Amino acid sequence: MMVISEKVRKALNDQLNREIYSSYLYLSMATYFDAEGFKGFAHWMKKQAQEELTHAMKFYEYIYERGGRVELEAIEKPPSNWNGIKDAFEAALKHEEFVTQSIYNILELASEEKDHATVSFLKWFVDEQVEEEDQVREILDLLEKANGQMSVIFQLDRYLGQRE
Amino acid sequence: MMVISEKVRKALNDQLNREIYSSYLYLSMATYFDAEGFKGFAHWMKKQAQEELTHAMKFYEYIYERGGRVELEAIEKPPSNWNGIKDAFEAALKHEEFVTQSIYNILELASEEKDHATVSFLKWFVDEQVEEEDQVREILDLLEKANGQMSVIFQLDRYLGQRE
Amino acid sequence: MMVISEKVRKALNDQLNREIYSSYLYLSMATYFDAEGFKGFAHWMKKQAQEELTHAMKFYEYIYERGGRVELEAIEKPPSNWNGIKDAFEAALKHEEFVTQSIYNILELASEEKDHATVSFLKWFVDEQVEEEDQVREILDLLEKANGQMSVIFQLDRYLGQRE
Amino acid sequence: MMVISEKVRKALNDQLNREIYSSYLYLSMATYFDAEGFKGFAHWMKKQAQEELTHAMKFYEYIYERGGRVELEAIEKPPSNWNGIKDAFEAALKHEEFVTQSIYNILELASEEKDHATVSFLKWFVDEQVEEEDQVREILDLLEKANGQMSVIFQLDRYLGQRE
Amino acid sequence: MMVISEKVRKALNDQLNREIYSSYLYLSMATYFDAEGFKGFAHWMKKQAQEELTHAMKFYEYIYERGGRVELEAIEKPPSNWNGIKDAFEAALKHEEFVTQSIYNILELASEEKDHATVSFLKWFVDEQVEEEDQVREILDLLEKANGQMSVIFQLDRYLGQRE
Amino acid sequence: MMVISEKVRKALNDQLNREIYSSYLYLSMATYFDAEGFKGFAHWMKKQAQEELTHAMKFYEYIYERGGRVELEAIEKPPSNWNGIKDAFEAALKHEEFVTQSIYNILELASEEKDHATVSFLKWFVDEQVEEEDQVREILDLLEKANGQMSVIFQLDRYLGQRE
Ligand SMILES: CCCCCCCCCCCCCCCCCCCC
Ligand SMILES: CCCCCCCCCCCCCCCCCCCC
Numbered sequence: 016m017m018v019i020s021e022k023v024r025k026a027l028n029d030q031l032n033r034e035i036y037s038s039y040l041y042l043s044m045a046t047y048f049d050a051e052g053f054k055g056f057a058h059w060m061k062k063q064a065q066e067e068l069t070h071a072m073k074f075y076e077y078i079y080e081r082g083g084r085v086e087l088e089a090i091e092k093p094p095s096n097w098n099g100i101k102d103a104f105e106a107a108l109k110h111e112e113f114v115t116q117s118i119y120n121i122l123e124l125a126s127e128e129k130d131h132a133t134v135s136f137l138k139w140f141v142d143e144q145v146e147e148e149d150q151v152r153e154i155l156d157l158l159e160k161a162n163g164q165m166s167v168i169f170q171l172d173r174y175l176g177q178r179e
Numbered sequence: 180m181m182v183i184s185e186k187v188r189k190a191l192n193d194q195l196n197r198e199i200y201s202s203y204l205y206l207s208m209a210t211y212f213d214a215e216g217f218k219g220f221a222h223w224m225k226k227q228a229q230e231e232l233t234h235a236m237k238f239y240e241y242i243y244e245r246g247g248r249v250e251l252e253a254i255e256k257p258p259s260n261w262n263g264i265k266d267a268f269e270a271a272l273k274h275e276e277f278v279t280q281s282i283y284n285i286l287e288l289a290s291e292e293k294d295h296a297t298v299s300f301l302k303w304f305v306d307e308q309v310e311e312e313d314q315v316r317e318i319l320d321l322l323e324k325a326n327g328q329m330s331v332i333f334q335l336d337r338y339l340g341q342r343e
Numbered sequence: 344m345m346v347i348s349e350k351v352r353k354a355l356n357d358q359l360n361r362e363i364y365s366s367y368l369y370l371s372m373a374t375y376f377d378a379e380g381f382k383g384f385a386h387w388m389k390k391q392a393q394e395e396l397t398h399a400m401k402f403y404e405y406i407y408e409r410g411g412r413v414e415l416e417a418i419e420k421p422p423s424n425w426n427g428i429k430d431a432f433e434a435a436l437k438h439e440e441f442v443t444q445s446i447y448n449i450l451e452l453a454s455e456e457k458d459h460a461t462v463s464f465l466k467w468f469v470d471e472q473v474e475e476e477d478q479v480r481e482i483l484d485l486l487e488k489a490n491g492q493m494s495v496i497f498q499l500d501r502y503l504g505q506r507e
Numbered sequence: 508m509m510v511i512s513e514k515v516r517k518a519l520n521d522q523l524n525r526e527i528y529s530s531y532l533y534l535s536m537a538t539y540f541d542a543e544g545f546k547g548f549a550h551w552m553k554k555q556a557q558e559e560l561t562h563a564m565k566f567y568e569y570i571y572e573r574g575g576r577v578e579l580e581a582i583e584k585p586p587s588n589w590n591g592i593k594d595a596f597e598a599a600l601k602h603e604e605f606v607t608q609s610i611y612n613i614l615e616l617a618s619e620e621k622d623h624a625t626v627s628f629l630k631w632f633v634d635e636q637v638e639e640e641d642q643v644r645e646i647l648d649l650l651e652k653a654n655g656q657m658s659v660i661f662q663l664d665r666y667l668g669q670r671e
Numbered sequence: 672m673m674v675i676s677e678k679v680r681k682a683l684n685d686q687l688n689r690e691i692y693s694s695y696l697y698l699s700m701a702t703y704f705d706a707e708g709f710k711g712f713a714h715w716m717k718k719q720a721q722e723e724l725t726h727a728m729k730f731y732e733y734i735y736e737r738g739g740r741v742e743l744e745a746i747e748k749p750p751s752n753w754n755g756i757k758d759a760f761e762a763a764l765k766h767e768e769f770v771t772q773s774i775y776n777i778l779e780l781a782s783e784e785k786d787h788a789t790v791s792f793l794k795w796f797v798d799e800q801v802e803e804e805d806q807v808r809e810i811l812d813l814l815e816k817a818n819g820q821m822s823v824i825f826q827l828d829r830y831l832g833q834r835e
Numbered sequence: 836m837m838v839i840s841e842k843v844r845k846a847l848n849d850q851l852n853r854e855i856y857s858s859y860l861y862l863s864m865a866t867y868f869d870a871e872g873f874k875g876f877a878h879w880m881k882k883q884a885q886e887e888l889t890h891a892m893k894f895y896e897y898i899y900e901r902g903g904r905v906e907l908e909a910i911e912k913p914p915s916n917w918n919g920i921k922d923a924f925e926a927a928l929k930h931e932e933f934v935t936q937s938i939y940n941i942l943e944l945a946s947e948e949k950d951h952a953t954v955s956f957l958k959w960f961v962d963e964q965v966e967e968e969d970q971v972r973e974i975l976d977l978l979e980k981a982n983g984q985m986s987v988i989f990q991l992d993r994y995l996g997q998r999e
């Protein structure tokens with residue numbers, strides 16, 4: 016039998032589908048950077064999309080570990096265009112903050128039910144949001160000092176294009 | 180400039196979005212096998228899902244090589260349930276034949292427009308479909324001989340669970 | 344001076360003694376499997392007994408780290424017999440669920456006394472119980488597909504006998 | 508089926524349960540030493556408990572080798588307190604000598620039934636008991652020699668804490 | 672945009688400054704032991720001072736991770752003398768227990784504001800405080816068993832002097 | 836007994852505390868650079884801070900080597916804000932020139948009192964000050980040629996972030 020409540024399973028399953036969309040969004044940011052000829056920024060976004068998928072699969076495996084089942088839902092069309100490099104990264108940061116708030120909501124739901132297993136499972140994602148939000152803020156800080164200077168954009172494109 | 184016609188770019192972009200869906204369908208087949216307790220069949224479907232993503236990124240990179248750009252569309256909800264192992268693998272076979280025919284249509288359109296560059300590019304996918312259809316047929320053939328014998332199904336699950 | 348409360352030290356010492364009993368119970372399940380001639384299942388139970396000893400010793404060392412003291416209590420006679428392989432596994436799963444709930448009680452006790460050190464110490468056991476329950480559920484699922492057919496029971500005996 | 512008499516099977520089964528207690532007693536001596544702050548003596552006692560477990564398991568496997576089966580019984584609450592280090596080690600010697608006589612009684616019983624297999628199996632424990640008794644006597648001798656000087660007790664605690 | 676509240680940034684910045692004082696305190700204890708000619712105890716205190724700096728720098732980096740900044744405050748003059756070795760270590764134990772309570776206060780504040788990121792970040796410091804308090808008690812227990820015998824003080828001096 | 840005069844013990848002890856403040860000042864400059872988003876300059880300051888600590892500890896050990904005693908004094912609150920990158924490095928240079936003059940004052944004092952050991956011991960610090968003043972002067976020269984230009988400042992930031 017399933018040892019998560021149906022309310023926590025649905026929250027976990029909802030977050031899994033949220034992570035699939037996040038991975039899709041970053042791929043669509045990659046389509047934008049490649050359309051604009053920034054292969055380094057695009058590469059960074061392709062790697063970010065891959066990383067979101069591994070988040071989704073950790074939700075996947077935890078649900079089955081607790082006797083639940085995953086049901087995949089429709090994935091909405093992401094935006095495909097942004098008003099330049101900095102605009103895209105601002106949309107990225109606002110998106111990560113939304114992901115953080117949705118993780119917090121599952122954590123508060125689980126602790127209200129005394130589902131300590133799920134509370135503990137979610138700590139990893141809380142810690143990762145701190146790092147992912149920070150990565151985007153640091154990039155935005157550089158774009159704000161760059162003030163559109165192409166000599167600095169180029170070096171930043173090549174640097175992010177080196178992401179492993 | 181873009182050197183593919185818009186018709187051929189649309190056909191290639193539509194196909195990229197079909198590979199994304201295919202990936203999502205195989206993941207959904209994995210949600211079914213894990214719910215049924217066949218983790219080796221599930222593992223096989225998770226690897227299949229990754230493989231279709233690499234097909235999508237191949238379309239992606241060629242589209243930008245030809246001066247086009249990619250637009251991600253919404254991903255329809257895949258089915259999540261089948262009436263057993265054979266049913267799921269038969270749904271996979273039927274899907275691969277649909278993907279194959281989709282590829283054929285692009286090839287016939289590109290060749291109608293004398294887009295020899297895209298005709299040549301598609302050869303890789305024609306050959307890949309031969310292998311992918313064959314792999315499902317092989318599993319269907321083994322499942323047919325197993326005929327519900329759990330002794331055979333167990334070893335089959337563990338063997339498919341070793342896919343790289 | 345002891346800086347855990349007497350109620351939290353008592354809860355921890357009680358849990359330590361529970362883990363000793365858990366180890367004894369699994370050893371007694373081993374006496375059952377060995378009597379029934381399943382040396383692989385018995386081997387699994389012996390390894391499970393050793394895992395519980397390490398749990399107890401972790402409670403042991405945290406109690407002294409916190410300035411407390413451990414007092415070993417009498418250990419009661421575990422059952423010696425089960426109505427079959429699954430009956431034994433079902434008993435193990437029920438016991439593991441009981442162990443999880445008693446871990447939850449110390450954590451809820453520690454959290455009300457604002458004993459954050461003990462709340463944090465217990466997170467490893469919450470995460471460990473998720474895996475322990477999952478292993479037994481997976482084994483129960485395979486015996487459930489095995490349906491008492493000895494050719495696959497033999498394979499599961501060999502598989503579980505390889506546990507390190 | 509069983510080729511030991513039930514009288515030697517129960518004698519062997521009693522000794523197995525005796526050895527489980529022996530291990531519990533040494534862990535309780537560890538709880539005492541850790542309470543007194545002698546982690547090296549406590550470490551030695553934890554290792555001594557481990558070794559008694561292997562003795563129990565050697566009886567365990569021989570019982571099944573001869574076609575019998577093991578039944579675990581309740582384990583008595585060991586003492587938790589002693590009036591000093593020598594007093595705890597004096598009780599250890601007290602007990603190892605009781606364990607030796609406990610083995611002698613099985614050997615004399617097996618020899619009366621002409622159960623030569625069980626007589627010969629017991630030779631190992633006779634030789635092992637000689638070593639374990641001397642182990643403690645040498646430790647007690649150094650304690651007498653220490654004459655309560657913490658300068659030498661600290662080195663003995665450090666020495667015994669090095670037990671592999 | 673700072674994503675810690677101002678009361679949590681202040682709590683964290685205050686704790687950073689407390690850690691700065693703590694290392695300074697341990698250095699001043701080192702000045703005492705060096706004046707008394709116990710270079711091993713002084714060496715231990717020098718290592719403890721360096722470890723508190725690493726604790727300060729982890730608050731430092733987390734504050735900037737969350738979008739805040741650090742403000743260094745004046746550091747009070749620590750005591751320069753103690754009534755003996757164990758008097759100094761007793762002050763150290765009382766100080767570490769004070770540091771632990773100040774970490775507890777930040778955690779309760781963060782969880783009241785539902786700042787799950789800071790609550791999770793603080794778990795490392797909760798666990799580390801358990802080991803820092805335990806380390807001092809073990810030393811006090813040894814100084815209490817030494818009872819001023821210099822034959823035992825000399826070996827504790829050189830023992831603590833090999834701290835890495 | 837002490838074989839430096841009290842007038843050189845205090846001059847040396849004052850300089851030890853002076854070096855502690857220097858280390859704190861450089862940390863404060865790191866808080867400013869990190870607040871401004873220049874992680875390379877911040878890294879340089881963090882390394883400069885720990886370099887000042889090794890200066891302090893060399894005074895520490897020489898004071899005890901001459902039969903003296905160290906007394907830690909209060910630490911003044913360092914400034915936290917500067918008008919810009921170059922102003923911070925200009926403040927660093929003016930501070931280093933002040934530290935050099937304070938070493939000069941100790942050296943002239945020791946010389947008048949014919950304390951040849953301290954005169955010779957201070958030679959290392961004189962030569963080291965030439966180096967520290969020179970590194971800051973070189974950085975100021977590049978910042979002056981940069982003339983506030985972010986493309987060149989970013990390169991200086993990356994270079995100084997590579998400091999070992
Ligand atoms: C090279 C980077 C490509 C990233 C593509 C991200 C696309 C996200 C939307 C589609 C996701 C559906 C399929 C997911 C399958 C995941 C399988 C993981 C197995 C471990
Ligand atoms: C050897 C494999 C089987 C082991 C079965 C153990 C069953 C539990 C016995 C009761 C507990 C006795 C005390 C054991 C203490 C061990 C402490 C080890 C510390 C290093």
Ligand SMILES: CCCCCCCCCCCCCCCCCCCC
Pocket residue numbers: 691694695698717718720721724728855858859862881882884885888892
């Ligand atoms: C060899 C022993 C060194 C002991 C140092 C004790 C320092 C006490 C606190 C003084 C102020 C410290 C300010 C500098 C912080 C340096 C941070 C280094 C890592 C970035």
